[PDB]
Amino acid sequence: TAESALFVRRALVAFLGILLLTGVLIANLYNLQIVRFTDYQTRSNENRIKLVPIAPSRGIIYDRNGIPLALNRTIYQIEMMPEKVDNVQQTLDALRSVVDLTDDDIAAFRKERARSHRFTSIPVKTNLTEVQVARFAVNQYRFPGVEVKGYKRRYYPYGSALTHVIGYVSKINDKDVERLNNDGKLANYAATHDIGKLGIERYYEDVLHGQTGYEEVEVNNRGRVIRQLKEVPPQAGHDIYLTLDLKLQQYIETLLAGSRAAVVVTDPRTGGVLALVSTPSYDPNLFVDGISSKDYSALLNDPNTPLVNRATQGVYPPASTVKPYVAVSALSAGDRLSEWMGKFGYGHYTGIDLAEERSGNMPTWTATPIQMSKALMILINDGIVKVPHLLMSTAEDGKQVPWVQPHEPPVGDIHSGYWELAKDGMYGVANRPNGTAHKYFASAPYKIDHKLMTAFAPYNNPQVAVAMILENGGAGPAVGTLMRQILDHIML
Amino acid sequence: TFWDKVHLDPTMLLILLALLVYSALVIWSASGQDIGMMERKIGQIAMGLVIMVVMAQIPPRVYEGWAPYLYIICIILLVAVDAFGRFQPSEIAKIAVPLMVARFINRDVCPPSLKNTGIALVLIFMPTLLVAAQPDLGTSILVALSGLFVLFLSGLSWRLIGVAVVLVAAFIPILWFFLMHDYQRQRVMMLLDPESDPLGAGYHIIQSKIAIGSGGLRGKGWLHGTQSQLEFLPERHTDFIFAVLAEELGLVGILILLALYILLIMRGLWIAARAQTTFGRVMAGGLMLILFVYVFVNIGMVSGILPVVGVPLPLVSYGGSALIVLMAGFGIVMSIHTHRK
């Protein structure tokens, strides 16, 4: 009948279609495994061709002057394959006898023996010394599957100097793994083991990390790259140039010492943050090189709370620091003040280059130091808004591009004398006997319980604006003198 | 006249037995010589044979009569599973929607009526595709294509097919220009390009490509015995069982497997073209074409061309549901072939 012929024709068409698809598949396979025959090129079966990820050279964070701030050195580790070891206990004892491996290291290895997904690498020792590396190298052949390897772990030469600002990179745990899975970022993060948990390492984590490389390397025994065939170069993280003056950072920290506190110096003209300071600033290298549970717990319960970056997490009442802005609002309007402050930046994220920033509360009062920095910046600029950015530039084709400020509705009208009124009031407070801060800046050749204070030295065309907090009063002299020599050092 | 008395097709049964034996050997290779997994796979094969034989007995007229009820219960339970946030019933969907579609076609004029019948069939389709795509997209494509083949074989007008093709090919560039917003288009490229973005979704596909390249030559590569390197890609026994097959059998193993799969398809279509009632004429065609969709989708997966999708290789893998549903389809086909008048 008609239906029989119609079905026969339609089935023949479908059969031809599936034959063409089969031809496509067979052509794929012929190209993939016949023409591309060198995909094995493996003379000895024991060799593998594992697709080794290539961690990219993480961007070195510089500062305004240009000197490096956080570096990347080669730290050596003891590595082995659990599934290619003749006897775990004998090998562990041999390690104890050649590199003075401690029983705590054995316990950590066993914890990770199960924690770390099977069929992969497992570390045992950290911060391996050069002598230990030499001993292992000279007696390497006497171990089943143990190999030493150097992995670039972020080094902070100035250490406790910039730890909250620059940040620290710590091990990727299951929570970070699933977080990146949510964003489909495991591809770019397979190689790296340490990933930023705070500081610039986090906010510019993607900027400072970049695309991670990969390679199809035919590794023989001991996991040695010997027949590298395909490898996409790793996009080295762009070397962010912070708006930082490391010398000023060191000076502020040295004059701070025990006094717990935070200092957010800035430059209204360009919008940068000259110096971001937090007192405790736990050593960052501890987190990079396998921080143990004991030390991390000690830090967590430490009364000084080193883990808190007082520049952003520190949400403290500005107290008298808000007087210029309330004055400006009043002059611009003959709870509207809440709306005006929200426009200034209080009660909202400031756009600072720190993802770990607490917005704070705007009663309808706790504002972070960077929030006061932004408010002062707007005050200097006569209402023009500039984000308190820390990224002065980055690496591009030209290797340097200035950070472009995102224009947003400036508060009020620029051509109004109200802003100058607030500036003059602050200048008089800082340079008149009736003012409280006069004693701290009387001798300046150029015009200029928590204890906070913010000011800008060069009244005529200011080039540096500061806002800082002295937590619980610190331990040194009054904050005024501190800012006095800070300003003195800023431009001599 | 014994096989017809039992209501089984000798040729399909023989080819399927050969393919099942080959699958058993491949799983032995891919199971790490695991005795328990091999025992479970043999049990699954036996259950599949039993269900195939049982389904080959009930007459096709009963299939036509009960297709509305089977389809209704399948839709109800798909609505249930999509609700509540048991066993993934997509197999029931991809064995049922072709039945309902073939019945509806059989109850109409010889070729389907343009936008009078084809619209009704597509409307039957859409609830099934929506329910089977809401949790995951993989099985949804199979559920659609399975019965889209039935519609295509029923005589769906070439005018409608061409109009739809032209409209989609004109809408794609519009999607490629107006709806090319950066991250949507980037995600589309990522999904379309599996081998791209290594170390992530493409990590296992690239490992599979390295596996197939290694010992994949026409020289058979290293043969059987797990004399291979295939634990780099996990689940080597369920989805990338084709990767294991390639790396442990060369190109010849792949060619033999594909030859068996195409032989099964040809026999199924050959006995479908002989079916008397149009319902059985188109049901068998739909079943065979969806089987080939399985084969092609999985082999493209492993060879690294199609996007990421969870379509297990037909009846060569670890897993009962896919095996039993394919076996049930083959049983339906043999019943159609043998019951005849």
Numbering used by the authors:
A (entry chain C): 388 to 721, 779 to 808, 835 to 918, 947 to 990
B (entry chain B): 9 to 93, 109 to 364
Reported in the publication:
PG assembly requires a glycosyltransferase (GT) to generate a glycan polymer using a Lipid II substrate, which is then crosslinked to the existing PG via a transpeptidase (TP) reaction. In E. coli, the GT RodA from the Shape, Elongation, Division, and Sporulation (SEDS) family, and PBP2, the monofunctional TP class B Penicillin Binding Protein, mediate these respective enzymatic tasks. In the periplasm, PG biosynthesis begins with a Lipid II-specific glycosyltransferase (GT) which forms a glycan strand polymer by linking the disaccharides of two Lipid II molecules, one termed the donor and the other the acceptor, and thereby releasing Und-PP from the donor site.
Here, we used single-particle cryo-electron microscopy (cryo-EM) to determine the structure of the E. coli RodA-PBP2 complex, expressed as a functional fusion and reconstituted in lipid-filled nanodiscs, to 3.0 Å resolution. The structure shows ten RodA TM helices, with intracellular N- and C-termini. TM helices 1-6 and TM helices 8–10 form a tight helical bundle, with TM helix 7 extending away from it, stabilized by three periplasmic juxtamembrane helices (PH1, PH2 and PH3). Additionally, the PBP2 single TM helix, is ordered and packs against RodA TM helices 8 and 9. Analysis of the RodA portion of the structure for putative substrate-binding sites reveals two major cavities (termed cavity A and B). Cavity A is located between TM helices 6, 7 and 9, and is framed on one side by PH1 and on the other by TM helices 5 and 6 and the periplasmic loop (PL3) connecting the two. Cavity B is located on the opposite side of RodA relative to cavity A, between TM helices 2, 3, 4 and 10 and is also exposed to the membrane. The region connecting the two cavities has some of the highest degree of conservation in the entire structure. Given their orientation in respect to the TP site of PBP2, we suggest that cavities A and B are the donor and acceptor sites for the two substrates, respectively. In our cryo-EM map, within the putative donor site there is a lipid-like density, which we tentatively assigned to Und-PP, a product of the GT reaction. Within the highly conserved region between the two cavities and centrally located in periplasmic loop 4 (PL4) is Asp262, previously identified as a catalytic residue15,17,29.
